[PDB]
Amino acid sequence: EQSLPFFKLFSFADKFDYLLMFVGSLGAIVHGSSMPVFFLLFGQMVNGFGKNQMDLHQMVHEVSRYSLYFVYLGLVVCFSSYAEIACWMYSGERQVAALRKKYLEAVLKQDVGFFDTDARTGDIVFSVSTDTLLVQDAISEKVGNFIHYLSTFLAGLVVGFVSAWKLALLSVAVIPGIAFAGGLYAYTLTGITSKSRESYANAGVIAEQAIAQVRTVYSYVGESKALNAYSDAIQYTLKLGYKAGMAKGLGLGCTYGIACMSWALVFWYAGVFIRNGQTDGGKAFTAIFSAIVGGMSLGQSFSNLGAFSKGKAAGYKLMEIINQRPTIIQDPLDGKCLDQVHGNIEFKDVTFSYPSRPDVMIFRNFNIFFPSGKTVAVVGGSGSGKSTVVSLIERFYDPNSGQILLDGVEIKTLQLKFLREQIGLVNQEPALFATTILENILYGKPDATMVEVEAAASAANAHSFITLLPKGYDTQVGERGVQLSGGQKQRIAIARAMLKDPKILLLDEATSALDASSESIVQEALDRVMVGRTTVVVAHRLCTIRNVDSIAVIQQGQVVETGTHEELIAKSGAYASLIRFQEMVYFYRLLKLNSPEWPYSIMGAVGSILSGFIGPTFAIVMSNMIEVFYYTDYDSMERKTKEYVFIYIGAGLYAVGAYLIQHYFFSIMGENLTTRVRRMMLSAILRNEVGWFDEDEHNSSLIAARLATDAADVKSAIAERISVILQNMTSLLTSFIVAFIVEWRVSLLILGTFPLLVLANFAQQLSLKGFAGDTAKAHAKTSMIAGEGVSNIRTVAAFNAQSKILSLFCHELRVPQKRSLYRSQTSGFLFGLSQLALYGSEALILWYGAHLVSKGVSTFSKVIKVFVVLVITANSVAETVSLAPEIIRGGEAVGSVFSVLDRQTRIDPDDADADPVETIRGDIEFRHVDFAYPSRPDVMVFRDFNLRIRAGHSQALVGASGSGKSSVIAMIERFYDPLAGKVMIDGKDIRRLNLKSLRLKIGLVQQEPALFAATIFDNIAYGKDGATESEVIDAARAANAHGFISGLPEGYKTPVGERGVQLSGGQKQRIAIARAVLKNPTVLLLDEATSALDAESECVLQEALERLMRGRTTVVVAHRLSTIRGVDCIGVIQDGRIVEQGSHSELVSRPEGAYSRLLQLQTHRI
């Protein structure tokens, strides 16, 4: 993008802030250096403990000192960590707050030229909020984290290198081998996952189409073929899921095996060194662990880099507005001061063009004069948003051509604020910034009293009007309870204009809201303050411009003439037509749902139990190895070490043999459940009622997206967690049993202090993700003010209150800074206190153990075999607690999303014992039926409606341009339910019939060209499923669409729609006719595309539909004013009431009645 330079984000601090930077850096360095020191202390103490095996009166002597050393190290770590966290977080917060202050201060400094509604104004809110959050997070946490881990790296590397000079190279040699497997695993898993998430979409599009056109699929209901295709695709998805699970298991197993093999190698070769007379045991131990931890510290270190570059991208596109110079500003040394303002305006040859883009000329030689105290106004040729004529009054845009003067005095040399207080301006948008009404009134004049406010309200007819509220006249404009525009607020701005009392006040096209009492009243209120005002009103609508005694006629952009509307009627002035036109206007039964897979899962738990034994075995054997080194015979340790190396290689093979089994069998539990829950969920969705789809959020583009994520969430929520919990619990339980069997008198202290150790290890884990916690949860309150302010730049420019806005913004930052200041301490101190214990308890345990020997019964063993095999498991068990948010805090909603799985339907598709449907003549009667739109309950559509077909008469219905009649046909089919009334079919109500059979018998035609994703042959074949292609060809002949498909090379086999050919014209509806003739139903419905089908060749459509009704009497509902072929039935029904039960062929004789409103179009206005 640009330079995006670092070390430039740190350019807004002071001498009171750099000290925090230095203290934080020192703390991070100390922490990082301290982490590998503990290994050196442990190794030195182990060496000292072992070297005096038969010299009892040295244990306490050389153990108490190291206990003191441990407590010292704990204190140092506590203080360093607390200091680093507090200093870094507070400094970052302060820097970002200062940057926001400067940015918002500079935002209003420039003019509105940069501000246009071309998504730039929307861009500003985003580039404030998200950009500031990104910068803050990036610097304030990642810099400290990076420094800490780099220090850990360097200290570990140096302390490892200078121990023995030999074991370090071997220790570091094994790292690239592990990293190779670690990278290959990630690459293969990511590739397989990316490949997998493609087959599902192949039927996800089918599902999206199905829910997209539910109103059609219920007609000709198959509701099963789509489900079969969905199952077919989900089968392949299941296969790829099995493959992915098997690959993941095998990869993890082989990685752990290679790690175990490397451990065996390093231990054997170190042991070869041990009895070669070159080094001791404990120093080798600390060398190995220090080198490994130093090498591995880089893994979590460089990961902080990812945000850093983004921060640089955040650095630019911000602060760029800071150094932008506007056009004009109130220069203090202007030296201009005028009195006796009259309000004379002199424009000279004004021709302007929009700087954003050259376009049609705004004006040409526009040189009008405005006399003082008159009602002069101007109007454009077609409106064209000429309100900018007053913009030059406020001077948003500099005049390029000529010059502008006020009262014969040039407006440029004078100070900008001078003309501000000669300007009274109101904007069309009546709503204003969210603030209490009294403060909003105060913007007219700062030091205003209650008497002035009530006088202005009386002038604006607002006194005792807004008072009819529960609040004591302290409501806020932005409050949602007074969200009504113009109801009670009545455009407070005019009142505050009365508070300002400017020399000249300007208006706009505020009458667009309505023409009623309130705005008329404010109109004569404006006319009351018209004295001493050269008020100019510019509006696209010119109905209420009679009061203006000076109007200018301009159409091409050049001023033509001025005068009065009374004499403008001569020659029509190109204005008579305009005025004439204006006057003419949770886990309860998920496993129960998983019951069918009774096998393939218990073996998974067996594999988990078998795999959980790797940890304690490794710890026990390593402790035996660290014990055996102190044998002093220089013989017979070779056999023991060979046996221990063999057991390492056997265990390394065991992980490969176990993880594969576990993560292959659990893949079945994770995938079969998803495949069997998706189908059930979709089946439940399909059988829902129609009105459930009417909600905007309940969209066809939303249900499928929700389904895709929530189906996959179940596998993670209900399958992996069981395995993880079982593995960790069995590992811990085995470890404690081994500890107790080995020794009992020491384990009491460990079991007592275990919660503290696991708490410290848990805090170490949270240290990685950052202690900043949630952001913008309480930091967005100022951002909302900033975003709202930057929207109404034009409004804020009028009635200049930039200082007040800046003061409010400055005062609003007191909350987040205080919260961050509290958070820094309450996090750092607690973290330090926790980190003290993890090393303090070490001293207690080991001092007690050392005091046990030489005073009681124990040896060098049974004090390490109880220490190192419980510290490891205490470290391990922390992950179970760390996974708590996912199972309960995260899985309670996404894991329980199947509310649609058991939601009860309004109308029951699958009837139990409803009456069957036999050969039926199909006569429908309505008796006082009631209906309304479920989406809008406030709208009354049909009340006590009555309608009936006499005896098999071809009925035609008036359309009235489709004014709500489209529901009538939907009343015959079981789309919705009547509110109250009787819908009789064949002497019985429609509510007591097996709706599937009736749907098979109901005939209906849609008025949309959308169709399915299959080929055209399947499109015709959809109706009357299972029909031979011969009758399909016959129906194609009848529909007269053979030419429409023969031109295409593929003929009947061409795919149509998306990923296929596209056809134009209304022939697709004709294709639906081909479907209808396949049904040839005993009951049929018809409809026409109202105000949509503007294509020609409607005669073919009329002939085809006439051919459709040859064998059966049908009913037609259409908006077509002509081409009605119904017999003795026109049924003119309007206003939700029956007003005509006659015939069109005989209603022509009626001069007055329903025919008068029927004669509205019907003949000529076609």
Side-chain angles (χ1 to χ4, degrees), residues 964-1008:
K965 297 212 188 86
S966 62
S967 309
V968 181
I969 62 170
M971 192 36 48
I972 295 90
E973 205 278 331
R974 294 304 309 270
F975 263 95
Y976 306 138
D977 184 74
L979 268 58
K982 172 185 184 179
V983 179
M984 183 278 288
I985 183 66
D986 205 8
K988 65 200 73 59
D989 206 340
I990 72 189
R991 221 189 72 179
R992 300 200 296 105
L993 277 296
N994 50 357
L995 53 87
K996 278 84 62 186
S997 305
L998 183 63
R999 293 181 184 271
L1000 189 137
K1001 301 253 174 80
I1002 297 298
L1004 183 63
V1005 59
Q1006 298 326 106
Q1007 314 315 127
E1008 298 298 324

Short mmCIF file of all heavy atoms in Angstrom, two decimals, residues 964-1008:
data_model
loop_
_atom_site.label_atom_id
_atom_site.label_comp_id
_atom_site.label_asym_id
_atom_site.label_seq_id
_atom_site.Cartn_x
_atom_site.Cartn_y
_atom_site.Cartn_z
N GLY A 964 -53.22 -6.92 -3.82
CA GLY A 964 -53.45 -7.85 -2.73
C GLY A 964 -54.28 -9.07 -3.06
O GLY A 964 -54.56 -9.86 -2.16
N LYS A 965 -54.68 -9.25 -4.32
CA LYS A 965 -55.50 -10.39 -4.69
C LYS A 965 -54.70 -11.68 -4.83
O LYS A 965 -55.30 -12.76 -4.89
CB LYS A 965 -56.24 -10.10 -6.00
CG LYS A 965 -57.21 -8.95 -5.92
CD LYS A 965 -58.40 -9.17 -6.84
CE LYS A 965 -59.29 -7.93 -6.91
NZ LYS A 965 -58.82 -6.98 -7.95
N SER A 966 -53.36 -11.60 -4.88
CA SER A 966 -52.55 -12.79 -5.06
C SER A 966 -52.72 -13.79 -3.92
O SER A 966 -52.41 -14.97 -4.10
CB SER A 966 -51.07 -12.40 -5.18
OG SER A 966 -50.62 -11.76 -4.01
N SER A 967 -53.21 -13.34 -2.76
CA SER A 967 -53.47 -14.25 -1.66
C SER A 967 -54.71 -15.11 -1.89
O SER A 967 -54.78 -16.21 -1.34
CB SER A 967 -53.61 -13.47 -0.35
OG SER A 967 -52.52 -12.59 -0.17
N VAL A 968 -55.66 -14.63 -2.69
CA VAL A 968 -56.93 -15.35 -2.86
C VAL A 968 -56.68 -16.77 -3.35
O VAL A 968 -57.21 -17.74 -2.80
CB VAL A 968 -57.86 -14.58 -3.83
CG1 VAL A 968 -59.18 -15.32 -3.97
CG2 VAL A 968 -58.09 -13.17 -3.33
N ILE A 969 -55.85 -16.91 -4.39
CA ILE A 969 -55.53 -18.24 -4.89
C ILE A 969 -54.82 -19.06 -3.82
O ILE A 969 -55.11 -20.25 -3.64
CB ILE A 969 -54.70 -18.13 -6.19
CG1 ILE A 969 -53.37 -17.42 -5.94
CG2 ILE A 969 -55.50 -17.43 -7.27
CD1 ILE A 969 -52.41 -17.48 -7.11
N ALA A 970 -53.93 -18.42 -3.06
CA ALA A 970 -53.26 -19.13 -1.97
C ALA A 970 -54.24 -19.61 -0.92
O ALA A 970 -53.89 -20.46 -0.10
CB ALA A 970 -52.20 -18.22 -1.33
N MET A 971 -55.46 -19.06 -0.90
CA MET A 971 -56.45 -19.53 0.05
C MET A 971 -57.01 -20.90 -0.33
O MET A 971 -57.40 -21.67 0.55
CB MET A 971 -57.58 -18.49 0.18
CG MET A 971 -58.56 -18.70 1.35
SD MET A 971 -57.94 -19.35 2.93
CE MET A 971 -56.49 -18.33 3.25
N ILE A 972 -57.07 -21.21 -1.64
CA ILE A 972 -57.58 -22.51 -2.05
C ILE A 972 -56.64 -23.62 -1.62
O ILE A 972 -57.07 -24.64 -1.07
CB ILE A 972 -57.84 -22.55 -3.57
CG1 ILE A 972 -58.96 -21.58 -3.98
CG2 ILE A 972 -58.16 -23.98 -4.01
CD1 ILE A 972 -58.50 -20.20 -4.32
N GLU A 973 -55.34 -23.44 -1.85
CA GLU A 973 -54.38 -24.43 -1.39
C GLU A 973 -54.01 -24.17 0.06
O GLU A 973 -54.16 -23.06 0.58
CB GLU A 973 -53.13 -24.41 -2.27
CG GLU A 973 -52.36 -25.73 -2.28
CD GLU A 973 -51.43 -25.89 -1.09
OE1 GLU A 973 -50.95 -24.87 -0.55
OE2 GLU A 973 -51.21 -27.04 -0.66
N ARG A 974 -53.53 -25.22 0.73
CA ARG A 974 -53.20 -25.12 2.15
C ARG A 974 -51.86 -24.40 2.35
O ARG A 974 -50.88 -24.96 2.85
CB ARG A 974 -53.17 -26.50 2.79
CG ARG A 974 -54.52 -27.19 2.83
CD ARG A 974 -55.54 -26.33 3.54
NE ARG A 974 -55.05 -25.86 4.84
CZ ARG A 974 -55.22 -26.51 5.98
NH1 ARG A 974 -55.85 -27.68 6.00
NH2 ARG A 974 -54.73 -26.00 7.11
N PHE A 975 -51.83 -23.14 1.93
CA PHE A 975 -50.68 -22.29 2.22
C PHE A 975 -50.75 -21.72 3.63
O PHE A 975 -49.86 -21.96 4.45
CB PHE A 975 -50.59 -21.15 1.19
CG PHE A 975 -49.64 -21.43 0.06
CD1 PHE A 975 -50.09 -21.96 -1.13
CD2 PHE A 975 -48.29 -21.14 0.19
CE1 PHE A 975 -49.22 -22.22 -2.17
CE2 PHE A 975 -47.41 -21.39 -0.85
CZ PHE A 975 -47.87 -21.93 -2.04
N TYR A 976 -51.81 -20.97 3.92
CA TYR A 976 -52.04 -20.39 5.24
C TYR A 976 -53.34 -20.93 5.81
O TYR A 976 -53.98 -21.81 5.24
CB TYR A 976 -52.07 -18.86 5.17
CG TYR A 976 -50.84 -18.25 4.53
CD1 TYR A 976 -50.96 -17.19 3.64
CD2 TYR A 976 -49.57 -18.72 4.83
CE1 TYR A 976 -49.84 -16.63 3.06
CE2 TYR A 976 -48.45 -18.16 4.26
CZ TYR A 976 -48.59 -17.12 3.37
OH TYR A 976 -47.48 -16.55 2.79
N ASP A 977 -53.74 -20.38 6.96
CA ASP A 977 -54.96 -20.79 7.63
C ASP A 977 -55.89 -19.59 7.80
O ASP A 977 -55.44 -18.51 8.21
CB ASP A 977 -54.65 -21.39 9.01
CG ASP A 977 -55.89 -21.93 9.69
OD1 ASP A 977 -56.39 -22.99 9.27
OD2 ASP A 977 -56.37 -21.28 10.65
N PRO A 978 -57.17 -19.73 7.48
CA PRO A 978 -58.10 -18.61 7.66
C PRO A 978 -58.22 -18.22 9.13
O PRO A 978 -58.19 -19.07 10.02
CB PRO A 978 -59.43 -19.15 7.12
CG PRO A 978 -59.06 -20.33 6.27
CD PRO A 978 -57.83 -20.91 6.90
N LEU A 979 -58.36 -16.92 9.37
CA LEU A 979 -58.54 -16.43 10.73
C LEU A 979 -59.85 -16.93 11.32
O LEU A 979 -59.89 -17.44 12.45
CB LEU A 979 -58.48 -14.90 10.76
CG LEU A 979 -57.13 -14.24 11.02
CD1 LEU A 979 -56.09 -14.66 9.98
CD2 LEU A 979 -57.28 -12.73 11.04
N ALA A 980 -60.94 -16.81 10.56
CA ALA A 980 -62.25 -17.28 10.98
C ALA A 980 -63.20 -17.34 9.79
O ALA A 980 -63.33 -16.36 9.05
CB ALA A 980 -62.83 -16.38 12.07
N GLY A 981 -63.86 -18.46 9.60
CA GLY A 981 -64.77 -18.63 8.49
C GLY A 981 -64.85 -20.08 8.08
O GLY A 981 -64.27 -20.96 8.72
N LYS A 982 -65.57 -20.33 6.98
CA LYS A 982 -65.76 -21.67 6.45
C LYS A 982 -65.25 -21.73 5.02
O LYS A 982 -65.68 -20.94 4.18
CB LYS A 982 -67.23 -22.08 6.52
CG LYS A 982 -67.54 -23.39 5.81
CD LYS A 982 -69.03 -23.68 5.80
CE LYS A 982 -69.33 -25.04 5.20
NZ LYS A 982 -70.78 -25.35 5.21
N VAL A 983 -64.35 -22.66 4.75
CA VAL A 983 -63.86 -22.92 3.40
C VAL A 983 -64.31 -24.33 3.04
O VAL A 983 -63.68 -25.32 3.42
CB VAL A 983 -62.33 -22.77 3.31
CG1 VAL A 983 -61.86 -23.07 1.89
CG2 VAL A 983 -61.91 -21.38 3.73
N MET A 984 -65.42 -24.42 2.30
CA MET A 984 -66.04 -25.70 2.00
C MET A 984 -65.57 -26.21 0.65
O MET A 984 -65.60 -25.48 -0.34
CB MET A 984 -67.56 -25.58 2.02
CG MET A 984 -68.32 -26.88 1.79
SD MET A 984 -68.49 -27.36 0.05
CE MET A 984 -69.69 -26.16 -0.52
N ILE A 985 -65.13 -27.47 0.62
CA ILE A 985 -64.84 -28.19 -0.61
C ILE A 985 -65.56 -29.53 -0.56
O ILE A 985 -65.41 -30.28 0.41
CB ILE A 985 -63.33 -28.37 -0.84
CG1 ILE A 985 -63.06 -29.08 -2.17
CG2 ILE A 985 -62.67 -29.10 0.33
CD1 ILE A 985 -63.45 -28.26 -3.38
N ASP A 986 -66.38 -29.80 -1.57
CA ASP A 986 -67.13 -31.06 -1.68
C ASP A 986 -67.93 -31.35 -0.41
O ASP A 986 -67.98 -32.48 0.07
CB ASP A 986 -66.19 -32.22 -2.00
CG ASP A 986 -66.90 -33.36 -2.70
OD1 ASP A 986 -68.08 -33.19 -3.07
OD2 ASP A 986 -66.28 -34.43 -2.89
N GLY A 987 -68.56 -30.31 0.13
CA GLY A 987 -69.40 -30.48 1.30
C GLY A 987 -68.67 -30.68 2.60
O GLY A 987 -69.27 -31.13 3.58
N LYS A 988 -67.38 -30.35 2.66
CA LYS A 988 -66.61 -30.51 3.89
C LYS A 988 -65.50 -29.48 3.92
O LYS A 988 -65.09 -28.93 2.89
CB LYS A 988 -66.04 -31.92 4.03
CG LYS A 988 -65.01 -32.29 2.97
CD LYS A 988 -64.85 -33.79 2.86
CE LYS A 988 -66.05 -34.43 2.19
NZ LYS A 988 -66.27 -33.89 0.82
N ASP A 989 -65.01 -29.21 5.13
CA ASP A 989 -63.93 -28.25 5.31
C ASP A 989 -62.61 -28.82 4.81
O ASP A 989 -62.37 -30.03 4.86
CB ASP A 989 -63.81 -27.85 6.78
CG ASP A 989 -63.19 -26.48 6.96
OD1 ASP A 989 -62.52 -25.99 6.02
OD2 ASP A 989 -63.37 -25.88 8.04
N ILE A 990 -61.74 -27.93 4.34
CA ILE A 990 -60.43 -28.33 3.84
C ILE A 990 -59.53 -28.82 4.97
O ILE A 990 -58.51 -29.48 4.71
CB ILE A 990 -59.77 -27.17 3.08
CG1 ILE A 990 -59.32 -26.08 4.06
CG2 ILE A 990 -60.73 -26.59 2.06
CD1 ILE A 990 -58.86 -24.81 3.39
N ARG A 991 -59.86 -28.51 6.22
CA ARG A 991 -58.99 -28.82 7.34
C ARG A 991 -58.98 -30.30 7.71
O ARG A 991 -58.12 -30.72 8.49
CB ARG A 991 -59.41 -28.00 8.57
CG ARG A 991 -58.24 -27.44 9.36
CD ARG A 991 -58.72 -26.83 10.67
NE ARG A 991 -59.14 -27.85 11.62
CZ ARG A 991 -59.59 -27.59 12.85
NH1 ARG A 991 -59.67 -26.34 13.27
NH2 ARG A 991 -59.95 -28.58 13.65
N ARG A 992 -59.90 -31.10 7.17
CA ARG A 992 -60.04 -32.50 7.55
C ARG A 992 -59.82 -33.43 6.36
O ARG A 992 -60.50 -34.44 6.20
CB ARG A 992 -61.41 -32.76 8.18
CG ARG A 992 -61.69 -31.94 9.42
CD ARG A 992 -62.79 -32.56 10.26
NE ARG A 992 -64.07 -32.59 9.55
CZ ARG A 992 -64.61 -33.68 9.01
NH1 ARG A 992 -63.97 -34.84 9.11
NH2 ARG A 992 -65.77 -33.61 8.38
N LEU A 993 -58.85 -33.10 5.52
CA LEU A 993 -58.49 -33.93 4.38
C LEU A 993 -56.99 -34.20 4.40
O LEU A 993 -56.20 -33.38 4.88
CB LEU A 993 -58.87 -33.27 3.04
CG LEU A 993 -60.29 -33.39 2.50
CD1 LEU A 993 -60.64 -34.84 2.19
CD2 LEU A 993 -61.33 -32.76 3.43
N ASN A 994 -56.60 -35.36 3.89
CA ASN A 994 -55.18 -35.68 3.76
C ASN A 994 -54.57 -34.76 2.71
O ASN A 994 -54.76 -34.96 1.51
CB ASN A 994 -54.97 -37.15 3.42
CG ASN A 994 -55.82 -37.61 2.25
OD1 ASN A 994 -56.61 -36.85 1.70
ND2 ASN A 994 -55.63 -38.86 1.84
N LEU A 995 -53.84 -33.75 3.17
CA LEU A 995 -53.45 -32.66 2.28
C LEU A 995 -52.52 -33.13 1.16
O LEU A 995 -52.44 -32.47 0.12
CB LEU A 995 -52.81 -31.53 3.08
CG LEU A 995 -51.65 -31.85 4.02
CD1 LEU A 995 -50.31 -31.82 3.31
CD2 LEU A 995 -51.66 -30.85 5.15
N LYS A 996 -51.81 -34.24 1.35
CA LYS A 996 -50.93 -34.73 0.29
C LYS A 996 -51.72 -35.09 -0.96
O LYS A 996 -51.36 -34.69 -2.08
CB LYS A 996 -50.13 -35.94 0.79
CG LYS A 996 -48.90 -35.58 1.61
CD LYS A 996 -49.27 -35.34 3.06
CE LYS A 996 -49.84 -36.60 3.69
NZ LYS A 996 -50.33 -36.36 5.07
N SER A 997 -52.81 -35.84 -0.79
CA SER A 997 -53.63 -36.22 -1.94
C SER A 997 -54.25 -35.00 -2.60
O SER A 997 -54.26 -34.89 -3.84
CB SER A 997 -54.72 -37.20 -1.50
OG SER A 997 -54.16 -38.33 -0.85
N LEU A 998 -54.74 -34.05 -1.80
CA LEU A 998 -55.31 -32.83 -2.37
C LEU A 998 -54.28 -32.05 -3.16
O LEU A 998 -54.57 -31.59 -4.28
CB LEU A 998 -55.91 -31.97 -1.26
CG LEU A 998 -56.59 -30.70 -1.78
CD1 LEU A 998 -57.78 -31.05 -2.67
CD2 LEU A 998 -57.03 -29.82 -0.62
N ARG A 999 -53.07 -31.91 -2.63
CA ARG A 999 -51.99 -31.28 -3.38
C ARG A 999 -51.74 -32.00 -4.69
O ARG A 999 -51.52 -31.36 -5.72
CB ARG A 999 -50.70 -31.30 -2.56
CG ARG A 999 -50.72 -30.44 -1.32
CD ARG A 999 -49.38 -30.52 -0.63
NE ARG A 999 -49.38 -29.77 0.61
CZ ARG A 999 -49.07 -28.49 0.71
NH1 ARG A 999 -48.74 -27.81 -0.38
NH2 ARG A 999 -49.09 -27.88 1.88
N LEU A 1000 -51.76 -33.33 -4.67
CA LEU A 1000 -51.64 -34.09 -5.91
C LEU A 1000 -52.78 -33.77 -6.86
O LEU A 1000 -52.62 -33.87 -8.08
CB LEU A 1000 -51.58 -35.58 -5.61
CG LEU A 1000 -51.23 -36.52 -6.77
CD1 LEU A 1000 -50.25 -37.58 -6.31
CD2 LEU A 1000 -52.49 -37.16 -7.33
N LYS A 1001 -53.94 -33.38 -6.32
CA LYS A 1001 -55.08 -33.04 -7.16
C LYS A 1001 -55.19 -31.55 -7.46
O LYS A 1001 -55.75 -31.18 -8.49
CB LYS A 1001 -56.37 -33.53 -6.52
CG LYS A 1001 -56.41 -35.03 -6.28
CD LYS A 1001 -57.35 -35.71 -7.27
CE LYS A 1001 -57.30 -37.22 -7.13
NZ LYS A 1001 -58.13 -37.71 -6.00
N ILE A 1002 -54.67 -30.68 -6.59
CA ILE A 1002 -54.70 -29.24 -6.86
C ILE A 1002 -53.77 -28.93 -8.03
O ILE A 1002 -52.64 -29.43 -8.10
CB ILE A 1002 -54.30 -28.44 -5.61
CG1 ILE A 1002 -55.29 -28.66 -4.47
CG2 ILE A 1002 -54.20 -26.96 -5.94
CD1 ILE A 1002 -56.69 -28.20 -4.78
N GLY A 1003 -54.25 -28.10 -8.95
CA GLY A 1003 -53.44 -27.58 -10.04
C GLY A 1003 -53.17 -26.10 -9.82
O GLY A 1003 -54.06 -25.36 -9.39
N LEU A 1004 -51.94 -25.68 -10.11
CA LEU A 1004 -51.53 -24.31 -9.88
C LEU A 1004 -50.39 -23.96 -10.83
O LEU A 1004 -49.58 -24.82 -11.18
CB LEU A 1004 -51.11 -24.08 -8.43
CG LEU A 1004 -50.71 -22.66 -8.02
CD1 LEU A 1004 -51.88 -21.70 -8.17
CD2 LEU A 1004 -50.18 -22.64 -6.60
N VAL A 1005 -50.33 -22.70 -11.23
CA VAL A 1005 -49.29 -22.19 -12.11
C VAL A 1005 -48.64 -20.98 -11.44
O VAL A 1005 -49.33 -20.13 -10.85
CB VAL A 1005 -49.84 -21.83 -13.50
CG1 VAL A 1005 -50.93 -20.77 -13.40
CG2 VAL A 1005 -48.72 -21.35 -14.41
N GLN A 1006 -47.32 -20.91 -11.52
CA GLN A 1006 -46.57 -19.80 -10.95
C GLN A 1006 -46.32 -18.74 -12.02
O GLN A 1006 -46.47 -18.97 -13.22
CB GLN A 1006 -45.25 -20.28 -10.37
CG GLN A 1006 -45.41 -21.27 -9.23
CD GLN A 1006 -46.64 -20.99 -8.39
OE1 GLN A 1006 -47.64 -21.69 -8.48
NE2 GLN A 1006 -46.56 -19.95 -7.56
N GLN A 1007 -45.93 -17.55 -11.55
CA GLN A 1007 -45.69 -16.40 -12.42
C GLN A 1007 -44.25 -15.93 -12.36
O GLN A 1007 -43.97 -14.74 -12.49
CB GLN A 1007 -46.64 -15.26 -12.08
CG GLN A 1007 -48.09 -15.68 -11.89
CD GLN A 1007 -48.57 -16.63 -12.97
OE1 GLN A 1007 -49.09 -17.71 -12.69
NE2 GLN A 1007 -48.39 -16.23 -14.23
N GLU A 1008 -43.31 -16.86 -12.15
CA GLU A 1008 -41.90 -16.53 -12.08
C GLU A 1008 -41.11 -17.45 -12.99
O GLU A 1008 -41.42 -18.65 -13.09
CB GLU A 1008 -41.38 -16.63 -10.64
CG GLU A 1008 -42.06 -15.67 -9.67
CD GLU A 1008 -41.84 -14.22 -10.04
OE1 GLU A 1008 -40.74 -13.88 -10.53
OE2 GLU A 1008 -42.77 -13.41 -9.85
#
